[PDB]
């Protein structure tokens, strides 16, 4: 019966060569994992609406106005690439593979352990005896139909533990509700405290409710008991590991060399703009690498910071990612930043409530904007830009002196093309559930891969409730007896990938652990310390270059 | 004015078999099938803030 | 967000660009979110009484 396990542990990575250049990666993880009895017997309905902020004039970005649906489950969804691959393996696929994708994976439950926390004096102290409980039991349940709303780990950065030889908790599972909420625009010290600021009472046609009793058939298992799930399959496409560095500048053929240099300091020379053969878009005699017609379109402007407010309240609206350039300009390419915990990857050795944040730069150098540098004239084009025939970014557009064309211009024409925004090795979100639209989004900031099928379904779990020897409904009594949980989780992703080959003479960047220094590729950064303290730092995505043309 | 680029000019005529039918006669067609997609009879909630 | 009443103008002629409509929300922004509007006769669906 009870009293013997029913699992194995494996967490490593298996490289299967299946020769033409695709490789099947299997990669095992397997944690222990941390459940405490939930403190919400039942299905809140918690209102949060902070107000220490969106009453303020100056504060609108700070609006966390919504009402959630706190539910007595936690969940196990561990899509993390940090909770998977290790840290050397991903060095190794990203300097290798020139594209990856995912397959199938599954997922197991073995060694349920139960076990309840009684009080007992000790010389006039109270310290706590742990006891097994057989008779215990946990409740499993994997909503693979997505009769709930998805709730992605990343999206809140509480998945699983990156740390194999360390336990984690799971993280508890909440979803949106439907709540009218409204807020006023207001500058700095606009005239009057700010106008609406109220939360909203519950729809008849948005009410959105459901249950786990109701929504999943959940698998009563003990101690001895053990769980596991089908072969899960994958239908996203596969994400090219590879940069562009082509500009709309650099495509078709060059213009002739009429000068050759003589020496390794001077360079050469073009043929007459005015007498050149070309095409350009401009019924001028002239022409340049500026005004020479493309093939298509290399990235495109995108609205700086365009917070579009709607029934739900304001947001800021997302924008894909790029490269940054010599513009230096972050938050206007979509430079996404994080802020992830110590069971995430922070040092635990920084003590303290302040986690660890990074600003993700893009490698698509191709698509990359500069906003030091945008600008437009006037329809009658000519070489002389007028004071009044051109739109630098130093226009003040809307009695504004800091907005300007730049942080309102959407250039995303049928001529638009961009690449993927690499996915991060650590606190990196994998896969995504598909928008229920007609029209959804070309692609996910959250995650390079999209189910274009179904979803994975996310794992959910919870406490068997232990009650009491007394207990009453009608009379508020809801005595449970203080237990806790701690299971195993088994799951393995395949995905299979293809690797590149050397084409080129000059040697092309890769990812290398340069000595303990001031060296960002330090070896420290991913070693153990004195104490036993680590951290996980995001890895470079991407290294070998790609030709766009 | 009319332009001899865009000039579109149809006539039923010469354009589709004119069936010609009386009193004691009658028509019918064929059964056309439709390949557009399905459209979801349900609303979305859901903002960006949730 | 979409250009509200972005008249556009062509060789045809100027025209009201189409815009997918969607909730109003609070902000009570009909014409602005492209709450469409119609207008039918009695043999489409009016009282015959008016």
Redesign the interface.
């Known amino acids: 019966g009870v009293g013997v396990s029913t699992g194995s542990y494996d967490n490593q990575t298996h490289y299967r060569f299946l020769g033409d250049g695709w490789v099947e990666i299997t990669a095992l993880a397997t944690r222990l994992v941390h459940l405490n009895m939930p403190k919400s017997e039942n299905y809140c309905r918690i209102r949060v609406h902070n107000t220490t902020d969106t009453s303020v004039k100056g504060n609108m970005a700070k609006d966390d106005?919504?009402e959630?649906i706190w539910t007595p489950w936690s969940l196990v969804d561990a899509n993390a690439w940090g909770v998977w691959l290790q840290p050397s393996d991903w060095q190794y696929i990203c300097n290798t593979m020139s594209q990856l994708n995912l397959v199938s994976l599954d997922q197991e439950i073995f060694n349920v352990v139960l076990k309840t926390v009684t009080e007992q004096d000790l010389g006039g102290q109270a310290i706590k005896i742990y006891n097994a409980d057989l008779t215990a039991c946990m409740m499993v349940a994997v909503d693979s139909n997505n009769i709930l709303?998805y709730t992605p780990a990343a999206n809140s950065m509480e998945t699983l533990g990156f740390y194999p030889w360390k336990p984690t908790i799971a993280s508890p599972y909440r979803?949106?509700?439907?709540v009218?909420?409204?807020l006023s625009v207001t500058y700095e010290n606009q005239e009057g405290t700010v106008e609406h600021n109220v939360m909203?009472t519950p729809?008849g046609?948005?009410?959105?409710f459901f249950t786990i009793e109701n929504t999943q058939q959940i698998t009563l298992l003990r101690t001895g008991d053990e769980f596991a799930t089908g072969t899960y399959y994958f239908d996203t496409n596969p994400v090219k590991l590879t940069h562009t560095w082509q500009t709309n500048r650099q495509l078709g053929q060059p213009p002739l060399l009429s000068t050759f240099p003589e020496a390794d300091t001077d360079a050469g020379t073009l043929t007459a703009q005015g007498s050149r053969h070309g095409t350009t878009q401009m019924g001028v005699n002239w022409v340049s690498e500026a005004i020479r017609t493309r093939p298509a379109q290399v990235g495109f402007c995108q609205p700086h910071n365009?917070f579009?407010?709607?029934?739900?309240?304001p947001?800021a609206?997302?924008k894909v990612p790029a490269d940054i350039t010599q513009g230096v300009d972050k938050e206007a390419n979509g430079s996404v930043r994080y802020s992830y915990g110590k069971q995430h990857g922070e040092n635990w050795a920084s003590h303290g409530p302040a986690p660890e944040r990074y600003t993700w730069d893009e490698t698509s150098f191709g698509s990359g904007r500069d906003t030091k540098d945008g600008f437009i004239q006037s329809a009658p084009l000519v070489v002389p830009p007028p004071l009044n025939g051109i739109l630098t970014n130093a226009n003040p557009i809307g009695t504004k002196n800091d907005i300007h064309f730049s942080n309102v211009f959407n250039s995303y024409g049928p001529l638009t093309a961009f690449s993927h925004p690499s996915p991060v090795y650590p606190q990196g979100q994998i896969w995504d559930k598909e928008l229920?639209?007609?029209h959804k989004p070309r692609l996910h900031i959250t995650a390079p891969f999209v189910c274009k099928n179904n979803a994975p379904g996310q794992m959910l779990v919870r406490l068997g409730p232990n009650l009491t020897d007394q207990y009453d409904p009608n009379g508020a009594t809801l005595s449970r007896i203080v237990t806790y949980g701690t299971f195993f989780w088994k799951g393995k992703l395949t995905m299979r990938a293809k690797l590149r080959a050397n084409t080129t003479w000059n040697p092309v960047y890769q990812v290398s652990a340069e000595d303990n220094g001031n060296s960002y590729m330090s070896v420290t950064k991913w070693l153990p310390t004195a104490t036993g303290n680590m951290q996980s730092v995001p890895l470079i995505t991407r290294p070998v270059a790609r030709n766009t043309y």
Do not use: I
């Not at 979803?175 to 439907?178: A, K």
């Not at 579009?308 to 309240?313: D, L, N, P, T, Y």
């Open positions: 106005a919504h959630q709303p979803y949106y509700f439907c009218d909420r409204d909203g729809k046609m948005n009410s959105q365009d579009e407010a709607s029934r739900a309240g947001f609206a997302p229920d639209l007609e």
